[PDB]
Amino acid sequence: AGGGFFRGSSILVSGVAGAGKSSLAAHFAAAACARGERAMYFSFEEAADQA
Amino acid sequence: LDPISAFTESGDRLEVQSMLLRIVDFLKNRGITGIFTHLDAGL
Ligand SMILES: Nc1ncnc2c1ncn2[C@@H]1O[C@H](COP(=O)(O)OP(=O)(O)O)[C@@H](O)[C@H]1O
């Protein structure tokens, strides 16, 4: 309801290997970048070029 | 690497993960294809 999460909020994309957590996070980031804001991606298991 | 499960017994919680990550990153940087067989956690 309302059409989205709250801004200053925390979101947990819980899953297992092969679920798509990283891609959902990347979609969040792409939303931020397309709306003119800045986003950060802290990868701990993947190179940035690989991402 | 067959099997990467052998090193589980001979190492602590973080040291085994660090060793495996070292090998993974080495093969990645040199561009080698890395086949890893295991007998699976965050691995
Ligand atoms: N072109 C594509 N078409 C359909 N599925 C895809 C495509 N590219 C990637 N995937 C799916 O994305 C998944 C990987 O998601 P990923 O973000 O790596 O999740 P996690 O990082 O949590 O394992 C794979 O299971 C794969 O099936």
CA A5 – CA A48 distance, rounded (Å): 26
A21 residue type, one letter: K
DSSP B6: G
Candidate of A14, A23, A42, A44 to mutate for ligand 1, largest count of ligand atoms within 8 Å of Cβ = A23
DSSP B1: -
Minimum CA distance residue for ligand 1 atom 20: A20
Q: Which atom of ligand 1 is nearest to the CA of A26?
A: 17
Nearest to A5 by CA among A41, A32, A23: A32
- Tell which residue, B33, B35, B30, B42, has the closest CA to residue B4: B35
Which residue type sits at A11? I
Q: Which residues line ligand 1 (CB under 6 A)?
A: A 15, 17-23
Rounded to whole angstroms, the Cα distance separating B23 from B17 reads 10
